[PDB]
Structure formats: C-alpha cells, structure tokens
C-alpha cells in the first residue's frame, strides 16, 4: 500500500496494556510519515522502542516520542535536523488523530501526539500525519494515567513497535 501501518505495543510499569496501530498518510505528508515510520522500526539505529508517553492530558491528548531525553526536551528526526512543517492539509478532527508536537513553526523532530478529543484549534500549528486504526480503546486507557498538567501516574512505555506489512 502507499500508506504504511505502524504498531506500538504499550506497557504500563512493565505490564502489557495492548496494541495500537496507525495509518500513516504518506500520500499527503510523505516526509513526516516516513520519519515516524522509520523511528517505529528502529531501522536508523534509534527510535521509539522503549520510549515513553511523557505527557498525557485527559480529554486532550497523549504525547510521546522523546527517545533521547524522555521528558520533552529531546527528540530527533531521521533527517539530521529538525524539519519543516510539511503542510497543514489534514485537520485535527477528533480522537485518534496522530500529529506532530513542536516548539514552534518548522521545528519537527520526533515528538508526536495522539488526540483523544476534537482539537480543531491546533489546525495550522501541528502537522497531522496519521490516525489510529486499531486500539483506540488502548489510547483511551492510556489517558487514565494523565493529569491536567500532563504528568503521568505510571510509566507508559512503547514496549515494542514496528511496521505491519
């Protein structure tokens, strides 16, 4: 297929929670899609396996992908530099949208978030690049570990992750 599918197996303090898979819209945002797909397979020799969802805000989103510092201040893309906002064609239309976290325009690295609500006000500020396929219930479970400021109550980790097909 043109759009790849990635899976994350989530664990909570080491205990298996379940699997979430995503469709990556390579047909609309190929550079952003390929970054997350390669970080998910580990093929560049670094990536998401073992990293954690460091910031989870109930009724808003789950954020992860800082596999270098584990707290939001790190992350790195496969391109050897942060990379531009590819486009803002796709919108934040409800739960399960997969979008890039950033520190302002054209600062994409490896951090991402999974929407657990409609967050339309993010349109034009975060590049949407995928959506949850299977496992939204697992995302909903993960939300229960967050707090209003995003601190998690248990270690929510990507125990394994890769490409399906």
């Amino acid at each position: 297929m043109v759009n790849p599918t990635v899976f994350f197996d989530i664990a909570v303090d080491g205990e298996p929670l379940g699997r979430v898979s995503f469709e990556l819209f390579a047909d609309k945002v190929p550079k952003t899609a390929e970054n997350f797909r390669a970080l998910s397979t580990g093929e560049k020799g670094f990536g998401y396996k073992g990293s954690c969802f460091h910031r989870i805000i109930p009724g808003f989103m789950c954020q992860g992908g800082d596999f270098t510092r584990h707290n939001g201040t790190g992350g790195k893309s496969i391109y050897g530099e942060k990379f531009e906002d590819e486009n803002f064609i796709l919108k934040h239309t409800g739960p399960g949208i997969l979008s890039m976290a950033n520190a302002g325009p054209n600062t994409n690295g490896s951090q991402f978030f999974i929407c657990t609500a409609k967050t339309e006000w993010l349109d034009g500020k975060h590049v949407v690049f995928g959506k949850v396929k299977e496992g939204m219930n697992i995302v909903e479970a993960m939300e229960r570990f967050g707090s209003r400021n995003g601190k998690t109550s248990k270690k929510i980790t990507i125990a394994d992750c890769g490409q399906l097909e």
Binding site: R55, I57, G59, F60, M61, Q63, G72, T73, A101, N102, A103, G104, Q111, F113, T119, L122, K125, H126, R148, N149, G150
Partner: protein, 135 residues
C-alpha cells in the same frame, strides 16, 4: 484594567522635555509606570517626540534583553494544554507580539509572570544607558 491615562502621560512628557536625560528621569519613570502592562509602557515611550538617537539606544537595549530572555527561557513543547497560557517570549514581554489580556493573564496567573515588571526593568536599563551617555 484601565489603559494609562492622558494625565500620567502628560507628566512623563513634561518630565522628558524639561530634564532631558538627567538621572532624574529614572525614578520618575518608575513612579508613573506603576502597575503598567507592556502596552502602557510602550504608550509612555511612544509619547516621546524627538530624541530619536536616545530612543534608538533604548530600543537596542530592549532588543538585547528580549533576546537574552529567550535564550534563558526555552519554549515548552506544544501543543499547549487547554486552559493554560503559553509562556511569554521576549517580544511578548516587550509588547510587540502579545495582546493586552495575555499581559493581564500573566500578571494575574498563579503565580504571576509579571511581564510588566520585567519589561520595565529592561526599559530602566535602557534609560540608564541614555543617562550615562548624555549626562
């Protein structure tokens, strides 16, 4: 919030016209600027007509301080959580890229980020630069 008054301004105008850039301008500025928002601080400064060279010296200090502020305050990762206000940048504190209710929120958030007091300190350092050149 009430935007500064023509009355306070008239006073700062009379101060700068008489005392030029003698040391006395500084304590005066501080008194007339009590509790000002960044917008109010810029309205006071904009009221100064002439003294273009000195006004550019102030601007250079404000730009330098604002960039220092950015350097020492890295932006948090977005997206911002609901309800929460983003952290001010240098240009927000100086009033170029922020609104008035943002200034108010910061000044009235918990605890405050007192963007008016901060900007006022930068202005003061710029007024010190001017006073040392002219007097």
């Amino acid at each position: 919030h009430q935007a500064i008054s023509p009355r306070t301004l008239n006073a700062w105008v009379k101060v700068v016209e008489e005392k030029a850039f003698s040391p006395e301008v500084i304590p005066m500025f501080s008194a007339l600027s009590e509790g000002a928002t960044p917008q109010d601080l810029n309205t006071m400064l904009n009221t100064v007509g002439g003294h273009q060279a000195a006004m550019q010296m102030l601007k250079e200090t404000i730009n330098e301080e604002a960039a220092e502020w950015d350097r020492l305050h890295p932006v948090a990762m977005a997206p911002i959580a609901p309800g929460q206000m983003r952290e001010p940048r240098g240009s927000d504190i100086a009033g170029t890229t922020s609104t008035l209710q943002e200034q108010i929120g910061w000044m009235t958030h918990n605890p405050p980020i007192p963007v008016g007091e901060i900007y006022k300190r930068w202005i003061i350092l710029g007024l010190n630069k001017i006073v040392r050149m002219y007097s």
